């Protein structure tokens, strides 16, 4: 039950949320994992510990993904620790809601530096280091293409940008035999989801009980449940298999068919 | 190396081409396979034989997919033979080129009966029989969304229709715990490819040597090679795994990043 | 205020609904209009009368769009009456809801014959007759790409097919200097909307008062109102202008930004 | 022949290229135009002069669109000069080709500051100032969604981002009665096209004669010709008409059906 045995994965923002779920599912299948974290050092070591309990190797490495020089440092350290890399999961990100009239250059820069520029440099580093048969997977969101959501231009734009990076990088990574895809999840139970899901729930309002949100979202899902980090980690695991080689340069929505 | 052990798959038009590649890759991973064929009985038994050599169980069952009553019969027989079904691969199809002015109702009907109606009924039968955790996968083509291709409205329209079926059926199959996706391949080495690839090759013309076509197409691929039935079968295998559960209602292009 | 002066338009199913709104807006701008109708003869003559009151010329011509030979007859008569054609609006269509398990070949055929095959032949006739600078516009629906709607595979698939026709026909009509686009409306106040809108309203149920439906849909629209046939006719008018020449082979959603 | 009579338009980067073509076509139809320019002061005054010869009013106003405070200043001046605004055309942009490994933070920032951040602030200013019935139109490119193009991640990503802004801003501008759309042109004869078109021509190479490029691109167009700034200006003119009100939150490809 170890299709990824002998491979090395790097996941940005793997200390918690989706990042953690991806790190765990990759490790459960044999991959050694570099658990990057921005500031959640304790959560990251906890993930390394969870990996160990699953028989997987891992290492927590701090790096501020919104700073390109730190992304380069992160990769240098990861390669120094595990000797090479195969899979790169660009996951770090932030939600953001703001009246467009109130958006300042500072807020704009903060959002794009992490959500977009950070992913560009993580992808550049993947092109630089990923071994043949490798995989680079960026993170967009269904919000990049959704309609009817207000005060969300920074988030929608920063995620849509990454979809353009995916198609470009797939061409650029071809000679190296590394595929590049982009995942676009629907709602997934995490801290970000608990803070922002009301904006997506049918009839949602600020202050709506989380259980009601969860129920409204699950009811809009063909599978009648909300997604969890493990659902994303399992799908990413499948994309990391040799079997997924012919899937390249694609934006894949991971929604269970819901929202 | 048997993630699909104990599962039963049905593949329409599995006697040759992509269908055969899908049947073989599913069987290589543990699935028992119903090899449907329209008229290629000998190729189909050959596939059943190849499956046996891989340690997989298979059975060839004739059914004209362009006739709904025969699709229903095909499923009844498949269920009678293997006791149930988990994965349904709707693959049968035909290419078609025609000056739009020259298209007759008869040609229109012939194309849609197989490429579209056939897939609708195969999907209906999947909803009717697929067990929980099951998978239904329809076959479109990148030609459904390509621009610049002449005399191809019947093929483009018949394939685009199936993408609408995919989103609809995903909602309809949810309660049963069966996901529904659609694959849209780029060029894949088969009889259809050898007869029709010139239409897609850059600078292609009728009569262009097949080796030149192959070289032109491979050069337009990031992976620097053309796709083969095994590439499609491997990707479909990954989609049939439990790990792919959160991918639902999606049209996934299988192109290696090329055309 | 007559940008379409001297041009001749043919609109299928122009006796009522969206078709009527398109016929009226084209005539208001100078076009002579062939008002096709399947069985609503009285509504069609009413439209011809409304056109006359606007100073536009029109003629009602019966033709069952689900029968290719009648589509050919319709065009022969239209050309006999006005001497040529410039704009072809393929609008006739039907909604359809059905448990996929209950769909029969007869229902399938009925839906595709009108919604898809009919549009293919109307487009073929446009290629055959449209004068240089002409326009062919097909009708899809946002339902072709929507997710989360149950018992709707026949409608979603029959409309998605037309999007493939649009891209194909644009290539095929180029030499003749005729552009081909496809409109995909959101909800538009008509008989079809009054019978089917509950399926699209947030929290909709069969039996929900139409005023509540209208209010729920309008609230989901940035423009805070539901669309009407005139909104569609105005947009189609703009697409029929010489100014729209560079828009070709596109599926354009006409939703006011809503649903 | 003045559908836009009495309206005021602002076009970023209107001194030359597509921007100039848009300014001229809007003015030809009655709009007073604010011709913004970054550094081409002489070209901009030339455009103001061309507008005058067409009987349209115009004013050249310098503003570096890559600097948000200057975008705000540009709008303050435009409103001071013409008393209000109706149409905002966000057009300024740059092409960029670079081996992804060689991209520096400085290059990244330069590209996104103009192509993406600049458009966000132009859109914010449109929301702030556009009168009811107004229009905001952003500029993407078919390159945002194209496959097979190397060394182009910064351009593809910076343009794809704007498509996300379009959907978001359409929701945000609804209450004010201002629609927001995004145009995605194919090749259009301009300085940028003459410097970069080889990258898009079938079989293109650096150093390919421009006439051969033009011929190769035109041959890939259903209309058998390359697009020009006037083609874009005419389409934008149609989108600025009252008739286009129901088209909102859409990315419209302006390609004549080609590349
Ligand atoms: N949850 C959902 O429903 C959806 C989420 N997404 C996307 O999935 C990704 C993860 O989301 P989710 O897990 O829910 O997010 P959470 O907010 O729960 O956690 C986000 C992660 O981003 C990391 N991170 C933030 N800033 C930095 C930084 N500057 N440097 C390095 N790492 C950083 C965080 O780690 P740290 O604490 O150390 O800073 C954390 O691990 C994001 O890109 C998000 O936009 C997309 C669709 C849906
Ligand atoms: N090859 C390519 O590059 C691409 C192919 N596709 C699609 O993939 C699918 C398979 O293509 P490919 O393998 O290349 O095709 P081939 O023409 O090589 O074989 C097609 C299959 O369809 C089956 N079939 C045809 N008619 C019927 C029928 N009436 N009833 C039952 N089965 C039937 C054939 O079996 P039999 O001999 O018994 O009739 C055959 O197994 C098709 O849907 C095609 O449109 C999509 C994109 C690219
Ligand atoms: N209303 C909405 O919200 C939306 C509608 N649409 C599409 O827009 C189009 C028009 O919709 P709408 O006006 O609301 O529809 P209605 O049901 O109100 O009217 C439909 C039209 O189709 C015509 N028609 C039906 N069958 C035939 C036939 N066999 N031959 C010739 N004409 C025929 C009808 O005329 P007759 O009475 O003579 O048969 C009628 O004029 C359809 O294609 C529909 O799917 C798409 C998105 C949204
Ligand atoms: N030409 C084509 O084929 C296509 C073009 N596009 C897009 O269309 C838009 C225009 O393209 P095109 O006209 O060909 O471009 P050119 O390079 O010919 O001209 C671009 C314009 O951008 C302006 N500009 C550049 N920087 C600034 C700045 N910092 N501040 C203000 N204005 C600035 C320039 O004016 P100035 O000289 O004063 O700096 C110039 O008016 C761009 O967004 C481009 O990406 C999209 C698809 C195709
Ligand atoms: O990007 C995000 C963040 C949070 C969230 C909560 C619920 C539903 C959805 C989201 N998305 C997309 C759909
Ligand atoms: O659908 C088909 C059939 C045959 C073929 C040969 C080469 C390339 C491509 C195809 N496609 C899509 C792209
Ligand atoms: O196709 C149709 C038919 C009727 C209808 C009523 C309300 C909303 C919508 C529709 N659509 C798409 C969106
Ligand atoms: O964005 C650009 C810039 C220049 C150019 C030249 C030719 C063809 C095309 C472009 N595009 C898109 C398609």
TrEMBL record, chains A, B, C, D:
NADPH binds at residues 13, 16, 18, 38-40, 64-65, 91, 93, 155, 159, 188, 190, 192. The keyword Endoplasmic reticulum does not apply. This is Tetrahydroxynaphthalene reductase. Keywords: NADP, Nucleotide-binding, Oxidoreductase. Belongs to the short-chain dehydrogenases/reductases (SDR) family. Coiled coil: none annotated. SMART domains: PKS_KR (SM00822). Residues 7-186 form the Ketoreductase domain. The keyword Nucleotide-binding applies. SUPFAM superfamilies: NAD(P)-binding Rossmann-fold domains. It comes from the Eukaryota. Gene3D superfamilies: NAD(P)-binding Rossmann-like Domain. InterPro entries: KR_dom, NAD(P)-bd_dom_sf, Sc_DH/Rdtase_CS, SDR_fam. GO terms for molecular function: nucleotide binding; oxidoreductase activity.
């Amino acid at each position: 039950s170890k299709p990824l045995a002998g491979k090395v994965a790097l996941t940005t923002g793997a200390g918690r949320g989706i990042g953690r779920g991806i790190a765990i599912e990759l490790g459960r299948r044999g991959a050694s994992v570099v658990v990057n974290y921005g500031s959640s050092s304790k959560a990251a070591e906890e993930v390394v510990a969870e990996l160990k309990k699953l028989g997987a190797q891992g290492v927590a490495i701090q790096a501020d993904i919104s700073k390109p020089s730190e992304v380069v440092a992160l990769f240098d350290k990861a390669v120094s620790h595990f000797g090479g890399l195969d899979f790169v999961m660009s996951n770090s990100g932030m939600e953001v809601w703001c009246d467009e009239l109130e958006v300042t250059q500072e807020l704009f820069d903060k959002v794009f530096n992490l959500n977009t520029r950070g992913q560009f440099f993580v992808a550049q580093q993947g092109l630089k280091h990923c071994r043949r048969g490798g995989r680079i997977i960026l993170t967009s969101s269904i919000a990049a293409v959704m309609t009817g959501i207000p005060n969300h231009a920074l988030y929608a734009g920063s995620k849509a940008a990454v979809e353009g990076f995916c198609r470009a990088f797939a061409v650029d990574c071809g000679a190296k035999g590394v595929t590049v895809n982009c995942i676009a999840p629907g709602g997934v139970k995490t801290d970000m989801f608990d803070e922002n899901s009301w904006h997506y729930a049918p009839g949602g309002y600020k202050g709506m009980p989380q259980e009601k949100i969860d129920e409204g979202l699950a009811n809009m899902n063909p599978l009648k449940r909300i997604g969890y980090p493990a659902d994303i980690g399992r799908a990413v695991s499948a994309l990391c298999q040799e079997e997924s080689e012919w899937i390249n340069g694609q934006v894949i929505k991971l929604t269970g068919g819901g929202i």
